[PDB]
Amino acid sequence: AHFMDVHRGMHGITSDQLHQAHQADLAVEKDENVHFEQAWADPASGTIYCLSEGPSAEAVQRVHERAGHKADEIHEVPLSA
Amino acid sequence: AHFMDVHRGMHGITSDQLHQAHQADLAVEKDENVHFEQAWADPASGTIYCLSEGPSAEAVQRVHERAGHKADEIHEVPLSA
Ligand code: NI
Ligand code: NI
Ligand code: NI
Ligand code: NI
């Protein structure tokens, strides 16, 4: 399955910080067979969008939680175009 | 530049309908130098996410408007990982 998740209220995100948050997820995703495909950030609003492939939203969230940043919002996105 | 926009209230949207919306955007995006790279939809919550490339949020929204569906939110995502 695929998921879009959102982390809000981020303080002063830089490309370095985004790179590291993403790397922290990638480092431990194997333990849930999750694949963090892509992350985009809006540093002005303080928001990180994460696209992942995984068995379930719960799995994706267990990964974020271990990497110390549980997503504020997550939706399965079974449709794409 | 890069943008992520969100449409809500699309509960129960089908693959055909997402494809239709997407095609409607693509059909008029070129005039604004906008390209919709990816569209994902969650028919359960009724949430659509669109990743686009373009000169501004204004342009992207003008395209959505001509296509018949203004986005409820649009944010620039200058950072990606
Ligand atoms: Ni995928
Ligand atoms: Ni497409
Ligand atoms: Ni918002
Ligand atoms: Ni914003």
Author numbering:
A (entry chain B), B (entry chain A): 2 to 82
Question: Which passages does the manuscript contain on this structure?
Answer:
Here we showed that the 82-residue hypothetical protein SCO4226 is a nickel binding protein. The N-terminal four β-strands β1-4 of one subunit form an antiparallel β-sheet, whereas the C-terminal β5 swaps to the corresponding β-sheet (β1′-4′) of the symmetric subunit, completing an extended antiparallel β-sheet of five strands. Each asymmetric unit contains a dimer of SCO4226, with a buried interface area of about 1100 Å2 on each subunit.
In the structure of Ni-SCO4226, four nickel ions are assigned at the dimer interface, with Ni-1 and Ni-4 on one side, and Ni-2 and Ni-3 on the other. In addition, one citrate molecule is bound to Ni-1 via coordinate bonds. These four nickel ions are all surface exposed on the dimer interface with varying occupancies from 0.82 to 0.98. Ni-1 and Ni-2 interact with residues within one dimer whereas Ni-3 and Ni-4 are coordinated by residues from two adjacent dimers by symmetric operation. Specifically, Ni-1 is hexa-coordinated by His76-Nδ1, Asp43′-Oδ2, Ser46′-Oγ, and the O4, O7 and O6 atoms of the citrate molecule. Ni-2 is penta-coordinated by His23-Nε2, Ala82′-OXT, and three water molecules. Ni-3 of an octahedral geometry is hexa-coordinated by His3′-Nε2 and Glu38′-Oε2 of one dimer, His12″-Nε2 of the adjacent dimer, and three water molecules (residues from subunit A of the adjacent dimer were labeled with a double prime). The distances for all coordinate bonds are well within the expected range (2.06-2.46 Å).
